Amino acid sequence: NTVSGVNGPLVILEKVKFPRYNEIVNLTLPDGTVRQGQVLEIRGDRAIVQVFEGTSGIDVKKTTVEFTGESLRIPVSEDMLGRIFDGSGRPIDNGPKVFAEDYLDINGSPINPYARIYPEEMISTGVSAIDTMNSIARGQKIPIFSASGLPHNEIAAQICRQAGLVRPTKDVHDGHEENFSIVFAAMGVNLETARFFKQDFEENGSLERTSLFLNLANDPTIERIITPRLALTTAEYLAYQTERHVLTILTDMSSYADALREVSAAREEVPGRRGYPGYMYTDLSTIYERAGRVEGRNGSITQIPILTMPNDDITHPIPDLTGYITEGQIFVDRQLHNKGIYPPINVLPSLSRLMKSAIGEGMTRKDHGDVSNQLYAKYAIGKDAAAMKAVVGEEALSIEDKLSLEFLEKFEKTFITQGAYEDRTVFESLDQAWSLLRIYPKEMLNRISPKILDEFY
């Protein structure tokens, strides 16, 4: 029937209860506007709907409703590549619409046929500090966790432009034999910044192969929370149908959290851990189930989600759940950024679970994972030795600390400093590691086996 009342952007309708879940409703308002909504709730002769357009400007008994008869499902094509969109799937260039060739659910995974063969073949992004220290696979999810005030978006730009200039040399080594496409989701990202991501895609050659979804925080909350799910349906369709690796850059994870937080206050839900939703798990998990190899095992969706730390803490719920559901993390540290290191990838907690399950041979060394273990363990020791230098002073320090002090300094300006339009090969990073790691005797190098060690220190 009519709008009974309206609370924030959820609308209480009085309407007959026969419609199915997620079906579109259209409210015809006396302003001339039609606004679309989704039944969030069906109840006995009443519904609670989230409006897509707006959050207000909604009349009581003068507003009327009409049913589509159709569940909320995204019209997905592969003709949506090479064109720039908003967060609800419509061109902002105002030319021909998304259109469809399928409709796919965002309320539950469609097929859900993820990985029964572990993602295990390497993906290179042209960065030593990423690729060595954290091994990336085709379907694996490793996120970039940074702090407020950092250029999270600039590091994400590096990843995009250098990935796909590696790929033909990597094609030879075996790591691709299929089309590569980017699906880019912005929630809460600046106009300027977005324009930088388009430029990145021009450089790479995948402005024609990418879809960009722009939601601003000055566009409804309800649109904002659809934007990642819309991204996922697009990305698994390319991946499925024509067996493509799609890399998803989903910025920013807390912006998405933010919107969930407002339709929790507006719901009859109580917020759990630190003012965020007590169903915060279900949200995050919907995104992470979709990632891994999809049917035919030459298509995949690979994820790098981007998180900015809202309070700059790794005890705050957002990073803590997110980190558990994903496979590892990549840390960015503020002290580095200020110094003018690029990329400022501090490898003190940066670890990726698949390290000996993301590598094989014929494109990686099996030693690749082993080398990582020296590099990470020494980095830490070195970092500790520098902490003691600051306090006690060199004279006081013992011989073991001095070596390690030295290792740390060399690590910062050579390993994690590289250019921003400069590609690297996995072989090449390991050869750079061996020289730098070569500053200790065989007694002290013991996080790799004597066979491999005897050859190379």
């Binding site: 009974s4 309206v6 207000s56 400007g57 009349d59 005030g149 600046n190 925080a217 000055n218 309070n311």
Partner: protein, 593 residues
């Protein structure tokens, strides 16, 4: 329309709403106090009434104003002190004999004493007009016109009645446009809802600076106009002072001053100082005040006016962006502003979220900074404007790690600190090189380099010198002077001269408050030239004290360049710096030998 069902504190509940938008502006009862319908459950509405309901009875009617809570922005905005619901406070002072409004009484948003001179644009009888196309213009001050009247967004058609040139009143219509029948009548002002931002053809990446002319501001971490900027405060330990400085040195097309919820001594101060001050472009007619339009809310004045304050400023500002005017937007303070929201949330009986501050908070802060920026205005002419938002924040709950501040640093691209010690010394803004950053720098240094300056090389070197100077002092404490030598001693000395020349200012002179892009370029050129040549000279054999005494006249003359006229070599070009290069070469001979 409706009948009051209930009154529970400052929230009023009214039944028998059979159509009423959930943003609709309402006058409740027979007191006729301001309220806006927050939520609706059935025919019962929840309305927050933002003035006191002492004298309001259940069983009185509530009459809808017939439009949402919107503000009219017209000519005459300039030289006026306003609320966020927009009432002229000077008018109140006249009638009631008070700058605060009487409750249950309101006054027209724009002054109606004022009559302004309208001259036709370029669309004439029967010409098609389209959105953002300039239908005319009106003087907005005596000296200058600035309020160009464009066709309202969401309209388009053929202009059936175009009034002829002459002075008309804000009340009286001038234009009727036909599309679908007479679409409606138009006035010299247009209304636009406060939470709806005005539109553009497209937004651009700003590369254009502020016209502040504050030397350290320009050179070290370059000012952007079309940017977002967060500045620490703690209230009257420098932060209000810099906002007053920013107003003064600036000479933007418009400046919109927002007191979100300040102490009210500070609002009084802004009003009085400005017409005595002088614009740095050399304009007249109550100078700074003429270019400033003031939304000045103290925290005592209703909570509606506090919340509406930023909104009213951004919509106004955005319209000026559509007019082709570069606007400086000064907000003081967002910490107060987050508090306006938390208050409303607890009254109503909704749950606020993190740190007792609401759920809606983050989306609202975020929308506000992203709304501001450089754009080309809507319509065929495509004039360029900018909106730069500089918002002040202080600690809220006394922790400066709480959600409000931390949420905003993540969004910001620009940061310029405040420190109590630096503020005492008269360095304003109170910045060094790690309490401040700008990520706008990259595009900006590129912009300036094009203009003629050797800017990118020189700026990087500025940062390096300050960083080094700090570092060599620590060594002098722990290690000693054994790690100190004269090469290092010159490094300390160049940084001191850079601090005094750039960082310290307070407007001792008129030439200490406007310094062009070309002048700023010239100061950093002297000091870097001194540095490299002093170091060379001590290596071919010289001492620090010997270098210091010898450089002397030049050293004194270049420190004093801020007191000196910037019209010495033309009008922006300073002659002394051009003559420094040659002196420095002859000088280097005196220092070495």
């Amino acid at each position: 329309y409706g009948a009051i069902y209930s009154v529970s504190g400052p929230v009023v509940i009214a039944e028998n709403m059979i159509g009423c938008a959930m943003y609709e502006l309402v006058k409740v009862g027979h007191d006729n106090l301001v309220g806006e319908v927050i939520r609706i459950d059935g025919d019962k509405a929840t309305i927050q009434v933002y003035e006191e309901t002492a004298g309001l009875t259940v069983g009185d009617p509530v009459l809808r104003t017939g439009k949402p809570l919107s503000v009219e922005l017209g000519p005459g905005l300039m030289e006026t002190i306003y609320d966020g619901i927009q009432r002229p406070l000077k008018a109140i002072k006249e009638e009631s004999q008070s700058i605060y409004i009487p409750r249950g009484i309101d006054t027209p948003a724009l002054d109606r004493t004022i009559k302004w001179q309208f001259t036709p644009g370029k669309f004439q009888v029967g010409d098609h007009i389209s959105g953002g196309d300039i239908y005319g213009s009106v003087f907005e001050n005596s000296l200058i016109s600035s309020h160009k009247i464009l066709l309202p967004p969401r309209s388009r058609g053929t202009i059936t009645w175009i009034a002829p040139a002459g002075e008309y009143t804000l009340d009286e219509k001038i234009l009727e446009v036909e599309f679908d029948g007479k679409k409606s009548d138009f006035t010299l002002y247009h209304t636009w809802p406060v939470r709806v931002p005005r539109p553009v053809t497209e937004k651009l990446s700003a590369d254009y600076p502020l016209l502040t002319g504050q030397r350290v501001l320009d050179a070290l971490f370059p000012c952007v106009q079309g940017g977002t900027t967060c500045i620490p405060g703690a209230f009257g330990c420098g932060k209000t002072v810099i906002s007053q400085s920013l107003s003064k040195y600036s000479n933007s097309d418009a400046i919109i001053y927002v007191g979100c919820g300040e102490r009210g001594n500070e609002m009084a101060e802004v009003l009085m100082e400005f017409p005595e001050l002088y614009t740095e472009m050399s304009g007249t007619k109550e100078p700074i005040m003429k270019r400033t339009t003031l939304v000045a809310n103290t925290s005592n004045m209703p909570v509606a006016a506090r919340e509406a304050s930023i909104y009213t400023g951004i919509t106004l500002a955005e319209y000026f962006r559509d007019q082709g005017k570069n606007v400086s937007m000064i907000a003081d303070s967002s910490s107060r502003w987050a508090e306006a929201l938390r208050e409303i949330s607890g009254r109503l009986g909704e749950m606020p979220a993190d740190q007792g501050f609401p759920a809606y908070l983050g989306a609202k802060l975020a929308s506000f900074y992203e709304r501001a920026g450089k754009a080309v205005a809507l319509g065929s002419p495509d004039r360029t404007g900018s909106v730069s938002i500089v918002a002040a924040v202080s600690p809220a709950g006394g922790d400066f790690s709480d959600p409000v501040t931390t949420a905003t640093l993540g969004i910001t691209q620009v940061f310029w600190g405040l420190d109590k010690k630096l503020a005492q010394r008269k360095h304003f803004p109170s910045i060094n090189t790690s309490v401040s950053y700008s990520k706008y720098t990259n595009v900006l240094n590129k912009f300036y380099d094009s203009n003629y300056p050797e800017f990118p090389v020189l700026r990087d070197r500025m940062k390096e010198i300050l960083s080094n100077a700090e570092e060599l002092e620590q060594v002098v404490q722990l290690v000693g002077k054994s790690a100190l030598s004269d090469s290092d001693k010159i490094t300390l000395d160049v940084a001191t001269l850079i601090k005094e020349d750039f960082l310290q200012q307070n407007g001792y002179s008129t030439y200490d408050a406007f310094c062009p892009i070309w002048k700023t370029f010239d100061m950093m050129r002297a000091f870097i030239s001194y540095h490299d040549e002093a170091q060379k000279a001590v290596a071919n054999g010289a001492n620090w004290s010997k270098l210091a005494d010898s450089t002397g006249d030049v050293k004194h003359a270049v420190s004093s360049s801020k007191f000196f006229e910037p019209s010495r070599g033309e009008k922006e070009v300073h002659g002394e710096f051009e003559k420094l290069l040659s002196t420095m070469q002859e000088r280097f001979a005196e220092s070495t030998d």
